[PDB]
Structure 1
Amino acid sequence: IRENPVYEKKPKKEVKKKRWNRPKMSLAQKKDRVAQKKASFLRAQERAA
């Protein structure tokens, strides 16, 4: 340590961008999801009745 304390930064290696976590859902998707849920609910009672 007392001889060579200088830090040598790790050789930076470029890598292609990769997404590991889910992005935020869009309002249009959220509005559609509620619309789908309601429509499935009404059909569910329709088939049951």
Structure 2
Amino acid sequence: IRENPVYEKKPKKEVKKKRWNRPKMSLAQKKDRVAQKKASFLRAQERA
């Protein structure tokens, strides 16, 4: 430690831009999901 305290960083740049997280859904997607759920529920009733 006394002889060499200097820190050198480790380089890493050859990384592809991969996303591991689900992106936030859009307003159009949420509205469509609500519409599909309503349609499916009405369909289930009319099948009875």
Whether TM-score is above 0.5 comes out as: yes
Percent identity reads 100
TM-score of the two chains, using structure 1 as the length reference: 0.90
Q: Distance in 1 between matches of 2:31 and 2:13?
A: 42
| Residue segments in structure 1 that go unaligned for 5+ positions in a row | none
User: What is the SS of the residue equivalent to 1:2?
Assistant: coil
| Residue segments in structure 2 that go unaligned for 5+ positions in a row | none
User: What is the SS of the residue equivalent to 2:36?
Assistant: helix
Return the offset for 1:13: 2.8
| Number of equivalences | 48
TM-score of the two chains, using structure 2 as the length reference: 0.92
CA RMSD of aligned residues (A): 0.9
Q: Distance in 1 between matches of 2:35 and 2:11?
A: 51
User: What is the SS of the residue equivalent to 2:23?
Assistant: coil
Return the offset for 1:14: 2.4
